[PDB]
Design an enzyme around this catalytic site. Structure first.
Site, PDB file in Angstrom:
ATOM      1  N   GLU A  26       0.760  -1.269  -0.059  1.00  0.00           N
ATOM      2  CA  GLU A  26      -0.044  -0.035   0.049  1.00  0.00           C
ATOM      3  C   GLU A  26       0.976   1.326  -0.112  1.00  0.00           C
ATOM      4  OE1 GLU A  26      -3.407  -0.379  -0.048  1.00  0.00           O
ATOM      5  OE2 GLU A  26      -3.760   1.798  -0.277  1.00  0.00           O
ATOM      6  N   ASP A  27       1.324   1.548  -0.892  1.00  0.00           N
ATOM      7  CA  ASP A  27       2.032   2.718  -1.425  1.00  0.00           C
ATOM      8  C   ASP A  27       3.290   2.938  -0.632  1.00  0.00           C
ATOM      9  OD1 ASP A  27       0.893   6.291  -1.976  1.00  0.00           O
ATOM     10  OD2 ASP A  27       2.839   5.115  -2.745  1.00  0.00           O
ATOM     11  N   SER A  28       4.051   1.811  -0.083  1.00  0.00           N
ATOM     12  CA  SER A  28       5.034   1.820   0.612  1.00  0.00           C
ATOM     13  C   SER A  28       6.323   1.578  -0.225  1.00  0.00           C
ATOM     14  CB  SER A  28       4.968   1.057   1.955  1.00  0.00           C
ATOM     15  OG  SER A  28       4.024   1.347   2.943  1.00  0.00           O
ATOM     16  N   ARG A  78      -2.828   6.723 -10.194  1.00  0.00           N
ATOM     17  CA  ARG A  78      -1.827   7.899 -10.107  1.00  0.00           C
ATOM     18  C   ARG A  78      -1.524   8.309 -11.361  1.00  0.00           C
ATOM     19  NH1 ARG A  78       0.495   6.342  -4.959  1.00  0.00           N
ATOM     20  NH2 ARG A  78      -1.153   6.719  -3.499  1.00  0.00           N
TER      21      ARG A  78
END
Ligand code: ZN
Ligand code: ZN
Ligand code: ZN
Ligand code: ZN
Lengths: 117, 50, 48, 1132, 50, 90, 67
Positions: free
Chosen positions: D763-765, D933
């Site tokens: 998750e976006d890490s 994105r």
DNA sequence: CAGCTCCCTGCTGGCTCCGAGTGGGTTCTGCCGCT
């Protein structure tokens, strides 16, 4: 129909108001300041165009031709002088009920011709 | 799609475009332009997935 | 009714009094002044 | 000659010339310089002299004038009665928490007449008014024009742009404040009101003391119908416009109509103007109309001749100041008001269209100059109105007076210092009334952040408002306001920065333009009759209707000709010809935002190969941007003039023979990338990203840590962040060399592999390379500074010393041996949480300490310790502490495309995947962050970075280059032995098996943000408590507790965990017991040790109940009882 | 853009993708379009939470 | 909902000394035929035939709304022009 | 500030290559020729010098704290 | 039957509300004077 236009008292330069000369049963315009009377030549007092079918060509002015930001086309020539290039644009007016119609203005100044197609 | 939008603009300018019932000329021109652009975008997207 | 010190605590050398304590001080000042005027002077104008 | 296919270098050469001649805080510097040069002079001179008499007699009184002029201003000085005064270095001001201000001086001439007709005037030169805070790198700052070697000798950064004030040793930056333009007519139509259309023109004289006196001319929204009213300043009710004209002096009606409808052959105008005419056929002369206005005035006169004078004064000064306030300006005011009415009628008939409020042509920017002028004018009036009081207090007795004692030098300096230090823009008494947010503390975390804070606008409309129309990006923001850069919080679109070449006009006098205009063929209003006013064109200068011209053409050309040679009209002045509507407006006031554009004749630029050549050899031929402007090649175009002009994006692509689009261009843009700001100009390939990504990158560019300034070691500053090994990006825009980003970068060109390796970046890490971090990857050091000053009473003297246990009473368990005997730590000593740093004790009427403790869980090392004297002459100490921040998991990292993320795990080089070579990615991010994105600019950056690092060149990521694309970059990469699309065959770091999919990998410029996890992590277990209500404190620093808020309470209700809800809100926050009488539910008095429980008011003493309560509940009950409410709580 | 230009390029249509990049007009239009969503995200919270 | 604004093109008032005089050249009033100040409104065929009204319906609406304080004299649905004249009775 | 001792990715020594790299750039050598004249074959090591900004020189222009 | 009383309707001015948390920073807690 036409449009009624306000015209002014020659004595004190004020707005005339309609009146009926009951004796002669004839319309008279009366200044409420001074006793001046004058007989009306139009016989119409008030006109109101609700459909407002307006000829935008009267409000279009000739100097709009030298606007750098307006589009230019040679397909539609001017009618009096036959100048090849013409400047065209839309109404540019509020309360234009349904008008995408183009209004054209001729360049080559001192012509100033305006038409609609 | 651009040619179709241009010719729709031409029809609107030459007063050749009839307003859709329930709509004025401006909104029906807007509707035609949006329909053409959305159809073009959908077709290009579908070509992409293909 | 004047609220107790718990409702209006006073901190030490920021002693600093509370915002409500200042208003209560104004209340007691004006009440004492009005009282003493109403017995001694009884001007009936400044009293208003 | 003409320059073909050399544009990509010619345009950037001229841009480099522009950014060499003009800096990046040029608007700040010019506004402050113009302020302190001429606006302070005009403010100090236009103040009226004060004449003052005695108390009208003494027995059964003369005065004086005291007029002053010719202000003098000196350079900053510093010392007072201890040595001969010396200039203030700005770095010394920062260190000693002084105010980097400059004293201003005036010479006064007091002329006094008493008796016998003998006049003596005494002049006092260099009279001291106060000390004005002065902006750094200004024209009177001590760093003006100094070379880089001298700046380094003064411990100043040569790269520091300046443009900020040093006050109490803290950088202050005046944020530019937007406002509606003045002296211009706006016709609006509010939806729900008694009137349909309304025309307003807020008016101001040339920086007069009077505020914006706004006048509305409105039309009712439906007998007769459509009357026209004009609500007037200092008038309670609206006044019909014809009454206004008759009061102004026009007895007749034809004369009034000559000022509104300019062509009498248009009956549609008459049909709508007569409903307002027939409203006021009972007023026929000037005096009755004056009486009518005076009756509606805020101060109604008791007699007729008092209302006459009051309304005459209102018409003379309050209404339309900008068109003139003099003996006879009635004709000019009538012409302008009739123009306002004509403008309203044009909107009512639909001949024109309503003006747009968000059109930034209608906006003005209040920079440091105008803001300081507005505030200094008020303080100067306050100073005069106390010099007057002192003079009265001495002349009532009539002995004599001294102007030196009369002048209170404190007021001006203290008002300026308070306003700039706090942000409350106004008098200190109206702290809540004055608007705040102006003069913020300069953000000094990154050089890009400093530039962005120094180039920032502000819309002073209320926040948290549901009207999104002001917040939206307006079309007129092209090239003057950065579209990408804006805060994401409750200030979206309200706080907007400034474009690169966008320049704000500083203002000049329109008088030379006036004398130039009056001598060609135009006529002033007083000369002509309205007979010939309909066919000609109306000239406006700074919004005031100056005259009439028969030939708009060849006067527009003449004005442009003069502006292009700077003969009389300066470059900042904008001339605007409205063509379909005959107005021709000239603007000269300050605050007009404008940007430079090229000049285009028939279809060719005036920029030539000769210009490019003689400007390329700069520093020897000194052919600078100013010379380029003087050559008539470029113009400054604001929004008004941008409406009436035709631009081309690129001369090559938009000025050529083809299927014709315009063929009538007037200007061309130097380079479209200049529409971006400062933080958005560091984004590589910003047109390949979704715009919210660009906005987020513009926001996070202010948080990326790097060398924020060169002199960061002399700069004793709190919350200073510097990175060990900053790098200029491998792929960069051509606009970074002008932001000096390649000299003070914030980030490291990391080798990222966009792959799902283990799942610790899902998750976006992000995964980081532990070995790289050990080698120094994104390693930084955190500087925190601690200040303290000794003093404050008659005997309570503060002193720095080592507190000794038997002497001082109050002490922590902290060890005080780390202090030196003067009370401070020597630099270079390891320190930790709850360790004393400054040993300060106050005398106890033995002693009590006020020692400063190191912030809990900091655990750093003291860098340097400075001791000095503040402006009160007391010992002053500032201590700076180093603490390095090795990148750990949870530290927030981000790229140049709004792809933020915290480190999820750190693998060593062995655990990390690797190429055919030993290349292991420094960073691994989740591929699931791209598709929604849509940061295709990130992928193109990662590709071009590999291409550049293999080629040896620095990659070029100019937004609209069009000379580089993905296909060219791929073909260039394929030549170096790599897959053309950047993919590589990585091998698994644990098993050694090659990954079935091929990994996208390459160098990408990542940034380390200030949001470390060690600065956010905190817990609590029955720590400190607030004083008013006995609940846990708030804040990480105060060892506070988290808020179990109203929504968490609701969530627990929904869970149906009533015992857990009570545990959270009662025992875990503030368990408390109170005693309440059983008869009356009022709190009783309990004496537990003697077990005497009595409730007065009942005399029971026997039946008493103990009830357990939250302390907040008890205190609410006590507040209610103080409000005479009696919450009675019977337990039965 | 020329006055009264209702064409797709003059009113916000972006015929380029994220790979070919956006021409400066299209970049500004896309920024202005995304600004609306960004504003809505912030404004909506103060109503939805209430 | 339809008001009489929706259907009329323009409205004008005249001072006809005699209703028999017919200051405006309209033979319909000549063949059809007490105040001299009258009222005249011109409708359009477009909205008229869009909403399916008649001069009789409009006149009876006027007579019901205002009573016999005024008499409407409407042109028949045969001429290209859509005229109804309004007087005021005494 | 100063050139890192080792490449972050590779770990190859880069700390001794900066002065030689500047000397080679003080000649007809381009960056692409200087990098592989110094023996930087991997782009991980090449970027270490290619993208390095040497701020220690700007730091040394300030007078020291002591003497 | 005309004049007076009352109840309803309509309209305007006034009051209260405006996400949840979190990390920092800053200035400011009166001054003149006059006994
Ligand atoms: Zn008259
Ligand atoms: Zn012609
Ligand atoms: Zn009791
Ligand atoms: Zn390497």
């Amino acid at each position: 129909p036409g449009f009624v236009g306000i015209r002014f008292c020659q004595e004190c330069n004020n707005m005339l108001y309609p009146k009926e000369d009951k004796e002669n049963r004839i319309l008279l315009y009366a200044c409420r300041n001074c006793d001046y009377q004058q007989e009306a030549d139009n016989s119409c007092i008030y006109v109101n165009k609700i459909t407002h079918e307006v000829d935008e060509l009267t409000q279009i002015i000739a100097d709009v031709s030298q606007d750098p930001t307006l589009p230019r086309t040679e397909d539609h020539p001017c009618q009096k002088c036959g100048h090849k290039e013409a400047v065209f644009f839309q109404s540019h007016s509020a309360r234009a009920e349904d008008a995408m119609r183009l209004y054209y203005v001729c360049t080559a100044p001192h012509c100033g011709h305006r038409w609609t197609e | 799609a651009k040619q179709d939008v241009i010719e729709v603009i031409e029809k609107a300018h030459n007063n050749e475009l009839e307003p859709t019932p329930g709509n004025t000329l401006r909104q029906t021109f807007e509707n035609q332009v949006n329909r053409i652009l959305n159809d073009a975008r959908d077709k290009t997207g579908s070509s992409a997935q293909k | 009714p004047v609220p107790p010190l718990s409702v209006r605590p006073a901190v030490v050398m920021q002693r600093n009094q509370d915002d409500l304590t200042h208003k209560l001080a104004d209340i007691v000042k004006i009440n004492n002044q009005l009282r003493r005027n109403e017995q001694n002077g009884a001007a009936a104008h400044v009293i208003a | 000659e003409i320059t073909p296919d050399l544009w990509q270098e010619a345009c950037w050469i001229v841009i480099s010339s522009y950014f060499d001649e003009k800096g990046l805080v040029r608007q700040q510097l010019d506004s402050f310089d113009e302020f302190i040069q001429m606006s302070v002079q005009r403010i100090v001179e236009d103040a009226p002299p004060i004449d003052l008499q005695a108390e009208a007699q003494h027995a059964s009184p003369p005065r004086y004038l005291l007029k002053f002029e010719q202000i003098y201003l000196s350079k900053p000085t510093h010392w007072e009665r201890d040595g001969a005064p010396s200039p203030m270095m700005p770095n010394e001001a920062r260190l000693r928490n002084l105010t980097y201000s400059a004293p201003l001086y005036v010479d006064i001439t007091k002329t006094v007449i008493k008796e016998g007709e003998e006049q003596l005037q005494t002049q006092h030169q260099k009279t001291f008014i106060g000390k004005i805070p002065i902006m750094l790198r200004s024209t009177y700052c001590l760093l003006n024009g100094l070379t880089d070697r001298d700046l380094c000798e003064l411990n100043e950064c040569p790269l520091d742009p300046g443009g900020y004030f040093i006050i109490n040793g803290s950088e202050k930056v005046l944020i530019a404040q937007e406002k509606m333009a003045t002296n211009t007519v706006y016709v609006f139509a509010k939806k729900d009101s008694k009137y349909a259309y309304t025309g307003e023109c807020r008016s101001c004289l040339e920086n007069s003391s009077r505020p914006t006196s706004t006048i509305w001319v409105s039309m009712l929204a439906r007998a007769i119908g459509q009357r026209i009213v004009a609500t007037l300043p200092y008038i309670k009710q609206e006044v019909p416009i014809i009454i206004v004209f008759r009061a102004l002096g026009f007895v007749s009606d034809r004369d009034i109509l000559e000022h509104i409808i300019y062509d009498f052959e248009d009956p549609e105008m008459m049909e709508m103007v007569k409903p307002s005419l027939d409203e006021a056929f009972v007023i026929q002369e000037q005096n009755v109309a004056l009486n009518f206005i005076g009756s509606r005035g805020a101060k109604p006169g008791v007699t007729k001749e008092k209302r006459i004078k009051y309304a005459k004064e209102v018409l003379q000064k309050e209404m339309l100041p900008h068109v003139g306030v003099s003996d006879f300006c009635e004709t000019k005011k009538a012409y302008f008001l009739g123009y306002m009415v004509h403008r309203l009628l044009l909107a009512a008939l639909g001949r024109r269209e309503l003006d747009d409020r968000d059109h930034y042509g209608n906006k003005r920017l209040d920079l440091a100059g105008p803001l300081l002028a507005f505030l200094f004018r008020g303080m100067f009036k306050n100073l005069l109105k106390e010099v007057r009081i002192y003079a009265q207090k001495f002349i009532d007795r009539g002995k004599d007076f001294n102007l030196e004692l009369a002048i209170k030098t404190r007021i001006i300096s203290d008002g300026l210092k308070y306003s700039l230090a706090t942000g409350n823009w106004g008098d200190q008494k109206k702290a809540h009334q004055a608007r705040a947010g102006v003069s913020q503390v300069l953000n000094r975390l990154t050089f890009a952040s400093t530039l962005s804070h120094l180039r920032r606008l502000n819309s002073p409309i209320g926040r948290d408002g549901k009207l999104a129309k002001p917040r939206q990006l307006h079309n007129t923001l092209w090239g003057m306001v950065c579209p990408a850069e804006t805060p994401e919080g409750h200030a979206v679109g309200l706080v907007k920065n400034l474009a690169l070449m966008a320049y704000i006009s500083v203002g000049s006098q329109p008088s030379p333009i006036l004398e130039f205009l009056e001598e060609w063929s135009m006529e002033n209003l007083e000369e002509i009759s309205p007979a010939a006013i309909a066919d000609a064109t109306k000239i406006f200068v700074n919004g005031c209707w100056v005259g009439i011209h028969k030939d708009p053409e060849q006067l527009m050309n003449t004005l442009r000709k003069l502006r292009r040679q700077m003969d009389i009209i300066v470059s900042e002045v904008s001339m605007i010809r409205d063509i379909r509507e005959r107005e021709i407006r000239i603007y000269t006031d300050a605050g007009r935002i404008c940007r430079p554009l090229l000049i285009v004749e028939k279809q060719k630029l005036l920029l030539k190969k000769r210009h490019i050549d003689q400007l390329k050899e700069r520093e020897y031929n000194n052919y600078s941007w100013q010379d380029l402007v003087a050559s008539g090649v470029v113009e400054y175009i604001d929004t008004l003039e941008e409406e009436t002009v035709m631009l081309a994006m690129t001369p090559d692509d938009l000025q050529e023979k083809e299927v014709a689009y315009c063929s009538t261009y007037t200007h061309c843009e130097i380079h479209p990338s200049m529409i971006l700001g400062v933080c958005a100009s560091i984004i590589p390939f910003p047109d390949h990203n979704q715009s919210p990504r660009n906005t987020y990158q513009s926001a996070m560019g202010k948080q990326a840590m790097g060398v924020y300034i060169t002199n960061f070691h002399v700069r004793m500053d709190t919350l200073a962040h510097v990175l060990y090994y900053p790098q200029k990006p491998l792929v960069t825009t051509r606009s970074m060399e002008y932001l000096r980003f390649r000299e003070l970068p914030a980030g490291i060109n990391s080798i990222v592999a966009i792959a799902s390796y283990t799942g610790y970046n899902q998750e976006d890490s992000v995964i980081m390379n532990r070995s790289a971090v050990d080698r120094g990857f994104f390693r930084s050091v955190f500087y925190r500074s601690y200040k303290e000053q000794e003093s404050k009473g008659f005997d309570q003297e503060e002193v720095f010393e080592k507190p000794t246990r038997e002497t001082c009473q109050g002490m922590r368990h902290a060890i005080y041996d780390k202090l030196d005997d003067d009370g401070l730590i020597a630099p270079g000593v390891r320190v930790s949480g709850d360790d004393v740093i400054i040993g300060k004790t106050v005398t106890l009427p033995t002693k009590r300490d006020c020692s400063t403790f190191l912030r809990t869980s900091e655990t750093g090392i003291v860098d340097q310790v400075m001791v000095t004297l503040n402006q009160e002459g007391y010992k002053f100490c500032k201590i700076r502490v180093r603490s390095v921040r090795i990148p750990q998991i949870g530290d927030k990292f981000a790229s140049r495309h709004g792809q933020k993320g915290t480190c999820g795990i750190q693998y060593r080089q062995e655990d990390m995947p690797f190429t055919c070579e030993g290349i292991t990615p420094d960073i691994i991010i989740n591929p699931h962050a791209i598709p929604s994105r849509m940061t295709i600019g990130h992928l193109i950056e990662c590709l071009q970075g590999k291409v550049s690092a293999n080629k040896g060149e620095i990659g070029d990521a100019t937004p609209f280059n069009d000379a580089v694309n993905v296909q060219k970059i791929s073909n260039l990469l394929s030549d170096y032995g790599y897959h053309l699309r950047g993919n590589e065959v990585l091998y698994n770091g644990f098993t050694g098996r090659k990954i079935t999919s091929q990994i996208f990998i390459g160098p990408t410029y990542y940034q380390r943000l200030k949001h470390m996890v060690d600065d956010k992590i905190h817990s609590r277990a029955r720590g400190p408590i607030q004083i008013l209500n006995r609940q846990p404190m708030e804040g990480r620093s105060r060892d506070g507790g988290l808020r179990f808020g109203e929504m968490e309470r609701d969530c627990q209700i929904a869970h149906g965990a009533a015992q857990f809800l009570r545990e959270r809100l009662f025992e875990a926050s503030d368990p408390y017991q109170v005693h309440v009488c059983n008869l009356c539910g009022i709190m009783a008095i309990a004496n537990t040790r003697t077990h005497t429980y009595e409730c007065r008011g009942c005399r029971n003493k026997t039946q008493i109940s103990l009830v357990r309560m939250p302390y907040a509940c008890k205190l609410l009950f006590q507040e209610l009882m103080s409000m005479s409410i009696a919450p009675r709580m019977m337990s039965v | 853009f020329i006055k009264d230009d209702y064409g797709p390029e003059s009113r916000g249509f972006v015929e380029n993708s994220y790979l070919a990049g956006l021409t400066p007009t299209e970049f500004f239009f896309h920024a202005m379009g995304g600004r609306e969503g960004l504003i809505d995200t912030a404004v909506k919270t103060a109503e939805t939470g209430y | 909902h339809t008001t009489l604004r929706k259907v009329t093109a323009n409205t004008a008032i005249y001072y006809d000394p005699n209703p028999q005089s017919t200051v405006v050249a309209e033979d319909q009033e000549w063949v059809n035929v007490i105040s001299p100040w009258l009222l005249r409104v011109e409708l359009d065929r477009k909205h008229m035939t869009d909403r399916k009204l008649t001069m009789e319906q409009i006149a009876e609406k006027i007579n019901a709304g205002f009573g016999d304080d005024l008499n409407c004299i409407f042109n028949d649905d045969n001429a290209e022009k859509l005229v109804l004249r309004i007087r005021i009775m005494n | 500030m100063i050139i890192p001792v080792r490449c972050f990715t590779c770990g190859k020594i880069v700390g001794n290559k900066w002065e030689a790299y500047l000397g080679l750039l003080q000649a007809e050598y381009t960056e692409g020729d200087a990098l592989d004249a110094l023996g930087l074959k991997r782009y991980c090591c090449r970027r270490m010098l290619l993208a390095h900004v040497d701020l220690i020189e700007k730091l040394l222009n300030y007078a020291p704290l002591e003497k």
